[PDB]
CSV table of N, CA and C in Angstrom, one decimal:
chain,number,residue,atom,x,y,z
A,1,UNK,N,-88.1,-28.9,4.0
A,1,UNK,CA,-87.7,-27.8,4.9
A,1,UNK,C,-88.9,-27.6,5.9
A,2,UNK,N,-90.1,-27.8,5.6
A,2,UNK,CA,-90.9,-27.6,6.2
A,2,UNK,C,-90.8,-28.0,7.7
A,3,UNK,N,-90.2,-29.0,8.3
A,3,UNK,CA,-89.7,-29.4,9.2
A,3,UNK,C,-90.1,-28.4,10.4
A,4,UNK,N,-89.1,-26.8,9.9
A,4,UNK,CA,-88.9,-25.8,10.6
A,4,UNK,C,-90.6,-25.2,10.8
A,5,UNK,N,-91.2,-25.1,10.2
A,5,UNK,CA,-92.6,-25.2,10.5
A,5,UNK,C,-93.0,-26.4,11.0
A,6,UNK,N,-92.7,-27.6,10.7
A,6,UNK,CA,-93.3,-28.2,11.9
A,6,UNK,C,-92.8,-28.0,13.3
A,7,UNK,N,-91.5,-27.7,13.3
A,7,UNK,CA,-90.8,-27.5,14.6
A,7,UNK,C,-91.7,-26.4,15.7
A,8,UNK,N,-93.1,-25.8,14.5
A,8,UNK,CA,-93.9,-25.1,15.6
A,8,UNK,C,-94.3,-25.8,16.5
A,9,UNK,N,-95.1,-27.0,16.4
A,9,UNK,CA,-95.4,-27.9,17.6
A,9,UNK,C,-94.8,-27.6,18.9
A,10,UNK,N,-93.2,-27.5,18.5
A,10,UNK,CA,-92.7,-27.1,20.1
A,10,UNK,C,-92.8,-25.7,20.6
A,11,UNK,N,-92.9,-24.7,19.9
A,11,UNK,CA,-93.0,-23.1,20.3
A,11,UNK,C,-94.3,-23.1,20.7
A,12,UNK,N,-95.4,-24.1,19.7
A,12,UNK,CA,-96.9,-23.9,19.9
A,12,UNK,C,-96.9,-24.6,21.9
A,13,UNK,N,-96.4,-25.3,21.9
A,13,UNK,CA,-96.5,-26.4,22.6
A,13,UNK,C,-96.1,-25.9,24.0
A,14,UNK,N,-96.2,-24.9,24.0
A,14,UNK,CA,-95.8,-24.1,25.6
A,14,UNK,C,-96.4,-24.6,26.9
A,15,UNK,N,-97.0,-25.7,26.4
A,15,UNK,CA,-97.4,-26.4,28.0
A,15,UNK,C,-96.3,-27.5,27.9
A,16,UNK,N,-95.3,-27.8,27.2
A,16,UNK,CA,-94.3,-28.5,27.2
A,16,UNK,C,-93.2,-28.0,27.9
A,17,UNK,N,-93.1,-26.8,28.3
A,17,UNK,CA,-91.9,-26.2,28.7
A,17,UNK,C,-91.4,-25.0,27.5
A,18,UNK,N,-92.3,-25.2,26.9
A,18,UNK,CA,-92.0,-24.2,25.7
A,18,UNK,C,-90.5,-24.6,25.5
A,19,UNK,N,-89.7,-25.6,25.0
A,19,UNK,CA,-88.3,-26.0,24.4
A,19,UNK,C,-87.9,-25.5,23.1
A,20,UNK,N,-86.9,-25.1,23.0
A,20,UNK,CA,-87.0,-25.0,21.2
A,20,UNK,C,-85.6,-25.1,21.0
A,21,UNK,N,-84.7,-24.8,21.8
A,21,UNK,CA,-83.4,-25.5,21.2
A,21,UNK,C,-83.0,-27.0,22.0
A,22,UNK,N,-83.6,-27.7,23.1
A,22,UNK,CA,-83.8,-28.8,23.3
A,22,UNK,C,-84.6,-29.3,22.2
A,23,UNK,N,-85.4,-29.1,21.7
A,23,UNK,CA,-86.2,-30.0,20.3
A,23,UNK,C,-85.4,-30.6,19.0
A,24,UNK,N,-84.6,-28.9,19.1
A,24,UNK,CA,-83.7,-29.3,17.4
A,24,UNK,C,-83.1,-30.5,18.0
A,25,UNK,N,-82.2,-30.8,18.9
A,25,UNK,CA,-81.2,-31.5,19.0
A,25,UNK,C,-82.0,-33.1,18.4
A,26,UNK,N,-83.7,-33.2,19.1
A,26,UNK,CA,-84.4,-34.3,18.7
A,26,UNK,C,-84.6,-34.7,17.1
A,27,UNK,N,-84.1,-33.4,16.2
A,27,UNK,CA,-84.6,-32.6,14.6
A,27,UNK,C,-83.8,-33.3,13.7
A,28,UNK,N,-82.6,-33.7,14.7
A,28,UNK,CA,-81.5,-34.2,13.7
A,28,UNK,C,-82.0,-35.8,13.1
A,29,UNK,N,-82.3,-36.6,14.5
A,29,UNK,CA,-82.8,-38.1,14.2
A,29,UNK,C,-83.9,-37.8,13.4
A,30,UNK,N,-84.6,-36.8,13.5
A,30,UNK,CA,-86.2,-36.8,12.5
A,30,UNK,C,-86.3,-36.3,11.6
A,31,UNK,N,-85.4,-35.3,10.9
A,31,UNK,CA,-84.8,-34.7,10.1
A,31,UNK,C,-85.9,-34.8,9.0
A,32,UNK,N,-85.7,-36.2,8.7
A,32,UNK,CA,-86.4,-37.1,7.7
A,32,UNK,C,-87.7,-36.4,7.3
A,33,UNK,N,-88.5,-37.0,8.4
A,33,UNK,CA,-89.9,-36.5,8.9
A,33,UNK,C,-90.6,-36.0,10.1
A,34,UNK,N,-90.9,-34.7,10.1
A,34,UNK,CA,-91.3,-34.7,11.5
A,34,UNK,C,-92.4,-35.2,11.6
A,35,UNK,N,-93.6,-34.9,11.4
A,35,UNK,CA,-95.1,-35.1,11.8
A,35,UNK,C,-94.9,-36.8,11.5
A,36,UNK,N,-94.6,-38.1,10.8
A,36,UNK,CA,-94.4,-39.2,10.9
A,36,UNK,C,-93.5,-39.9,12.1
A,37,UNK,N,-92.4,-39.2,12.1
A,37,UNK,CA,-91.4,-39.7,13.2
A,37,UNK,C,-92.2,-39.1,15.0
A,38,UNK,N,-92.3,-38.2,14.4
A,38,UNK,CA,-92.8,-37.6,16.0
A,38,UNK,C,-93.8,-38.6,16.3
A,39,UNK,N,-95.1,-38.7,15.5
A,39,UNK,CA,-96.1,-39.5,15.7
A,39,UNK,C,-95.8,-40.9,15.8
A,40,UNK,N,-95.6,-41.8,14.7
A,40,UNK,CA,-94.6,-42.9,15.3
A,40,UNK,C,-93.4,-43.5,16.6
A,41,UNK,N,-92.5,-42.4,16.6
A,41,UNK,CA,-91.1,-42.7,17.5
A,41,UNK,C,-91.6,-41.5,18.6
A,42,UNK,N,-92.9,-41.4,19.2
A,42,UNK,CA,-93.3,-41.2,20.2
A,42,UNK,C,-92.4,-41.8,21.4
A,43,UNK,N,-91.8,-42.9,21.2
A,43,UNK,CA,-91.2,-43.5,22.3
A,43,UNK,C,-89.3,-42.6,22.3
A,44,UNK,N,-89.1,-43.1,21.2
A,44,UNK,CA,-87.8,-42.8,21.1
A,44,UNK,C,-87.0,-41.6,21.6
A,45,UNK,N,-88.1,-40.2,21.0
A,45,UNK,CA,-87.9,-39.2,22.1
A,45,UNK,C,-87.2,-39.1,23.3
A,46,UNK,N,-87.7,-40.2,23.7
A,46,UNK,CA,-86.7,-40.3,25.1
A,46,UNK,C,-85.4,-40.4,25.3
A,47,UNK,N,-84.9,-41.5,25.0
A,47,UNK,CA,-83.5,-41.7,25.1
A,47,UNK,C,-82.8,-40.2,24.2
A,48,UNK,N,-83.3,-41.1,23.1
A,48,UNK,CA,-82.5,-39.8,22.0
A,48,UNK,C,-82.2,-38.3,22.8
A,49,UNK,N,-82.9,-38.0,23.9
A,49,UNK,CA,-83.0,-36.8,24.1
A,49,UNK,C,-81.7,-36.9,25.3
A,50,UNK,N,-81.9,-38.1,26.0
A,50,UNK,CA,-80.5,-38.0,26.9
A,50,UNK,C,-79.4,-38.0,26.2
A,51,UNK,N,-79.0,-39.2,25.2
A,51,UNK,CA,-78.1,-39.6,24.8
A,51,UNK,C,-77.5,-38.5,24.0
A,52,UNK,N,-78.6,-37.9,23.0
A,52,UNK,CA,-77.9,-37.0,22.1
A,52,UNK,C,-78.1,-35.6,22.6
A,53,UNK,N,-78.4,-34.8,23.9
A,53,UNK,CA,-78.2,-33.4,24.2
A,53,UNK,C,-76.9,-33.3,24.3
A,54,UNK,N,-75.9,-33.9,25.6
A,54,UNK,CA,-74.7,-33.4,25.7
A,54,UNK,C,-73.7,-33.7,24.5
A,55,UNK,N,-74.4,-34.8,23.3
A,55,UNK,CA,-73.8,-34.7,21.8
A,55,UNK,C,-73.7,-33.4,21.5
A,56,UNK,N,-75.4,-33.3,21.2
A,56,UNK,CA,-75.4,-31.9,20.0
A,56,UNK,C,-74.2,-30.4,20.7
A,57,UNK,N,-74.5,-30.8,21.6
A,57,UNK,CA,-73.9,-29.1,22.7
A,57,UNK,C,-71.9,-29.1,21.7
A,58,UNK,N,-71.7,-30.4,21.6
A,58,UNK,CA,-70.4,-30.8,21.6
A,58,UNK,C,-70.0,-30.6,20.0
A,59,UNK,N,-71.3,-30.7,19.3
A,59,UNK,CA,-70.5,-30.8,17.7
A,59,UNK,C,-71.9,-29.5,17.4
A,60,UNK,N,-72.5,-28.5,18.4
A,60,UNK,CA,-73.5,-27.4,17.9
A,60,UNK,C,-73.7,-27.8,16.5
A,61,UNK,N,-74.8,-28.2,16.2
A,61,UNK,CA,-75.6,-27.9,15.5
A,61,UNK,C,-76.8,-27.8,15.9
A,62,UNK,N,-77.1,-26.9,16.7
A,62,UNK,CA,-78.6,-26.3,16.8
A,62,UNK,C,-79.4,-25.8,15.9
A,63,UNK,N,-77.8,-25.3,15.5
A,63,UNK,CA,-79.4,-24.2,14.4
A,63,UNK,C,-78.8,-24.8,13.2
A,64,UNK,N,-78.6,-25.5,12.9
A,64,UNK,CA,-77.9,-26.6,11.7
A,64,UNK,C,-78.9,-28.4,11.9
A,65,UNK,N,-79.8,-28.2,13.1
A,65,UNK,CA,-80.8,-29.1,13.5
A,65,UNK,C,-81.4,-29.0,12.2
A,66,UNK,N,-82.4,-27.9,11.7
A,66,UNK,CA,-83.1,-28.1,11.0
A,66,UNK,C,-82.7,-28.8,9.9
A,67,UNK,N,-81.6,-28.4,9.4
A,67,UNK,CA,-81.2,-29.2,8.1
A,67,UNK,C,-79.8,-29.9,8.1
C-alpha cells in the first residue's frame, strides 16, 4: 500500500506541475512497485501517460489507482 506514500513524490514534486490525479493514472502500470518502476521505467512514463490518460478517464479509476 505504501505506494500511496510513495505517490508523495508527485505532491512533493511541485516543480513537476504538482500532478496528482495525472500520476495515479501512471499507479496502475506501477502498481507493483513504485520507487523500482519509477526508477527503472523512467522511460515508459511517457507513452503510458498518453496512451493510458484518455483510458483511465473512461473506466475512472483514479482513486482506485492506488490499488
Amino acid at each position: 500500500m505504501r505506494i500511496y506514500k510513495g505517490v508523495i513524490q508527485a505532491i512533493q514534486k511541485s516543480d513537476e506541475g504538482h500532478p496528482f490525479r495525472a500520476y495515479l493514472e501512471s499507479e496502475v502500470a506501477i502498481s507493483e512497485e513504485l520507487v523500482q518502476k519509477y526508477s527503472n521505467s523512467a522511460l515508459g512514463h511517457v507513452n503510458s501517460t498518453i496512451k493510458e490518460l484518455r483510458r483511465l478517464f473512461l473506466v475512472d479509476d483514479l482513486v482506485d489507482s492506488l490499488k
